[PDB]
Design a protein around this nucleic acid. Structure first.
Lengths: 123, 45, 203
RNA sequence: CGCGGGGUGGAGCAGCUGGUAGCUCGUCGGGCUCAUAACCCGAAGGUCGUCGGUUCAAAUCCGGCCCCCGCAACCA
RNA sequence: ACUAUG
RNA sequence: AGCCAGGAUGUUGGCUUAGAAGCAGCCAUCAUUUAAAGAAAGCGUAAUAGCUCACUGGUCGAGUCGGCCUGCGCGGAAGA
RNA sequence: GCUCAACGGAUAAAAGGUACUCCGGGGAUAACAGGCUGAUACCGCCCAAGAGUUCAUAUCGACGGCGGUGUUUGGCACCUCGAUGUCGGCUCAUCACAUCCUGGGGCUGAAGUAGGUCCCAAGGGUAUGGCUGUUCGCCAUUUAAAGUGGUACGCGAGCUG
RNA sequence: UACCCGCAGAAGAAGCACCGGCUAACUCCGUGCCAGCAGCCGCGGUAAUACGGAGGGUGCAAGCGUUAAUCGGAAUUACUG
């Protein structure tokens, strides 16, 4: 349950380090992103050189949450920190070419098939 | 190849602006006799 | 000797001799288009009568020829009207004095809210809206001189058009190649081998 | 708009009590200087914003029109 | 009582 | 009123126009064919052509065309 | 012998301040809400010169003309001066339709996608932040859309101040 | 393979920089403070030994020039001095 003003860590290698959510996309009045949901973000910390600079606005996709995902049998996966992969604003492909940390099957789609390649672990 | 003039950005009339550049500027000549005409060396000897 | 009437608008004499500048109106028929070839720089060469030496000088002088030439629709304006900020009891809080006209083509806006009357504020803010649309006639006019005048200053040493040479006792229009040896013809007035043969050959 | 003031040679000013337009600078012409500036001599130039009235007569008194300033536009 | 510049 | 046929020839009238041939704009007032047809009424071409009305004979068989005066009506006519 | 000109002449002789204020009165008289009005404002129609390569009316529409609404700035002083507490914000709404989205249509200077304009339609729906006390507005990022109004410019014996 | 012998025919094999002074080597034509040259002084504004071309000449020569870099010249960091 990422919402406006939530700060997330960055799973990819893109340059960014912390980012802040600033909309949850795909609806009027929409409160939360969970896993596999697109959000508009801004970059706060960013490492000295790298694809993206502090203050850049772009999309991301949420890939890990503390609240957790739920699986059809009742099972929950929680993680220990909120996290996201930075995306282009228009194509909505990844910027990063590597991915740190585990991710989930909730991504497994047409759209984010590039990520679930690059992940170390899918749970 | 484009003259780089010493006037800044021209704003109105350019001919009158170049008139007041070193580009134009009186060319006077050395007299070879009388009244500014002394050489030490002279062109060859 | 082409029958135009020939005012002086403005002079400035030099302290010793000649003139620093001058402006000359030319009343008559197809004036501009005769003279428009003569805009440019002109190069003299002579032994100067003012130099105590007596050296060949090589002065320059412009001529420049330019011809002469001689209300905002309520549809184009939106007019927001709203309450004022500030000091004075029940009357300030309620009434909507304040105006904000806006031009939909450009984006320029205005206000007034000095007055109590909405109708004063409106016709005041109409005045500032006249002025501020007259002001973007100056910033198009001035930035489409210095568009066209930046790439006329491109041409540089070419800007000089004629070369009068009163001790080697001859001349050249530098564009055409048209030449005389009669120096005191042309200075008294007899130009027209230069002025025609420019037009004919297309500047 | 309410009240008041001002438009005079090219510039800044005086003359406004009806019959008379001055002051300093500038312009023009002559001199002095090798030349220019200063300095000396001589000459001009003002529809008195604009339109209309009043008077025998209007810069001047009176009205409208135009521009330019200043003061006021308050209590809720 | 004189004076500045080229 | 309907229904069928004809609406031409000098000639794209002239002048303008990249083009203007009835039909962008401007100036304008023919005879010929005779049943009669504008030197052009509206679509339409880059322009002709194309369609079609004024105009006219055929067919059919009783009232009909459109102004003036006056009565009553219709639309125009959305609010907590 | 008085410009006692405030000219039926208060004295021979007289200006201000009060947000530190007080008393008596007035809705005879103002500010706020209501009322009458509708110059102004908003919405609509009539005429059609012209723009739209050609063509007034797909879209616009000069010079002028006729209305509607009661929404803004006013005008009037009818109600309230032995009190009808004000902008904005919060909470809770409710109606109108001159419709922002969704639904049905007609014309298009509608190939398609996507638009323009008009007619019907009020069932439901109709952002979050930065700045500012702000309404309004500008900006950022969304959304199918971020509609225009009425309700003491709805709502303080409900909150804030 | 070095090296040695035979065959044919001058055959198959010369450029680069410079020529105002410093610095060895000069005259024409074009150009007219333009175009250009230039290490430093400077050359060029209608008779240019200094620009560009030609003819001649000087210097190197399978190389010749330009640039960069070090020492020299520089007794211009001096012990020598």
């Amino acid at each position: 349950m990422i919402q406006e003003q939530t700060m997330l860590n960055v799973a990819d290698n893109s340059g960014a380090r912390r980012v802040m959510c600033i909309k949850v996309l795909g609806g009027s009045h929409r409160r939360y992103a969970g896993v596999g949901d697109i959000i508009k973000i801004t970059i706060k910390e960013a490492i000295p050189r790298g694809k993206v600079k502090k203050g850049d606005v772009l999309k991301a996709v949420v890939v890990r949450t503390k609240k957790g995902v739920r699986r059809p049998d009742g099972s929950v996966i929680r993680f220990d920190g909120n996290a996201c992969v930075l995306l282009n604003n228009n194509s909505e492909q990844p910027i990063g070419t590597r991915i740190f940390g585990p991710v989930t099957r909730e991504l497994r789609s047409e759209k984010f098939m590039k990520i679930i390649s690059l992940a170390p672990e899918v749970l | 190849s484009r003259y780089q003039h010493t006037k800044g950005q021209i704003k109105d009339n350019a001919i009158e602006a170049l008139l007041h550049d070193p580009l134009f500027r009186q060319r006077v000549e050395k007299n070879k006799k009388g009244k500014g005409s002394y050489m030490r060396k002279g062109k060859h000897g | 000797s082409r029958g135009f009437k020939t005012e002086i608008i403005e002079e400035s004499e030099g302290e010793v001799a000649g003139i620093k500048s001058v402006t000359i109106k030319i009343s008559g028929d197809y004036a501009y288009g005769w003279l428009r070839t003569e805009t440019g720089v002109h190069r003299l060469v002579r032994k100067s009568p003012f130099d105590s030496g007596g050296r060949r000088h090589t002065s320059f002088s412009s001529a420049f020829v330019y011809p002469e030439v001689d209300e905002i629709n309520p549809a184009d304006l939106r007019i927001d009207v709203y309450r004022t900020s500030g000091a004075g009891g029940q009357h300030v809080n309620r009434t909507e004095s304040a105006v904000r006209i806006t031009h939909i083509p450009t984006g320029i806006v205005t206000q007034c809210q000095n007055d109590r009357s909405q109708h004063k504020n409106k016709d005041q803010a109409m005045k500032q809206m006249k002025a501020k649309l007259y002001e973007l006639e100056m910033q198009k006019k001035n930035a489409e001189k210095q568009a066209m005048e930046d790439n006329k200053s491109d041409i540089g040493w070419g800007s000089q058009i004629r070369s009068y040479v009163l001790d080697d006792s001859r001349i050249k229009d530098l564009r055409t190649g048209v030449e005389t040896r009669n120096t005191q013809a042309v200075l008294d007035g007899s130009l027209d081998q230069f002025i025609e043969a420019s037009l004919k050959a297309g500047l």
